[PDB]
Design a protein around this ligand. Structure first.
Ligand SMILES: C[C@@H](O)[C@H](N)C(=O)NS(=O)(=O)OC[C@H]1O[C@@H](n2cnc3c(N)ncnc32)[C@H](O)[C@@H]1O
Length: 143
């Protein structure tokens, strides 16, 4: 597998970078969480970030469960698809949004048209290319 670092547009200008090994779940993001003491993102608390390939904006919020040394230190939170995110979601009242159905296929208005209906694994590969082509892929690392 690979680790992808994506740049999400920030309200007012600029970007915040997030790392993930599950690029296909980006569309289910409900928040970007950062540790309240992280100087890299403190000034972004309270502003919003736009999910790549969508017109959806999500809050950049503070949560002490975030590890500054993991990934970029900025954690994309998808309550519907990760157990820790679910807890962050509970702490902040986030609404879980799922973009992968029980049969394992991508679904939902927030999912890019070219990805709807694809099985999760093919969607992962394709999502990376859509991100790359659109200028959201900062980098990729091999395990
Ligand atoms: C699917 C995403 O929405 C999910 N947040 C996630 O991180 N996906 S992941 O598989 O790339 O990440 C693996 C695990 O490491 C956790 N993790 C990654 N970065 C951090 C961080 N900076 N602080 C705390 N946990 C982290 C993720 O929440 C998840 O539990």
């Amino acid at each position: 597998g690979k680790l992808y670092t994506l740049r999400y547009e920030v309200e007012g200008g600029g970007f915040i970078e997030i790392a993930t090994v599950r690029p296909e779940t980006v569309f289910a993001d409900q928040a970007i969480a950062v540790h309240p003491e992280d100087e890299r993102y403190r000034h972004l608390l309270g502003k919003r970030a736009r999910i790549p390939l969508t017109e959806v904006w999500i809050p950049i919020l503070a949560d002490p469960a975030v590890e500054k040394d993991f990934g970029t230190g900025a954690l994309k939170v998808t309550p519907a698809h990760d157990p820790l995110d679910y807890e962050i979601g509970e702490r902040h009242g986030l609404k879980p949004v799922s973009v992968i159905n029980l049969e394992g296929r991508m679904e939902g208005e927030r999912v890019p048209e070219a990805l709807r209906g694809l099985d999760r694994f093919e969607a992962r590969r394709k999502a990376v290319e859509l991100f790359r082509e659109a200028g959201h892929l900062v980098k990729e690392e091999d395990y």
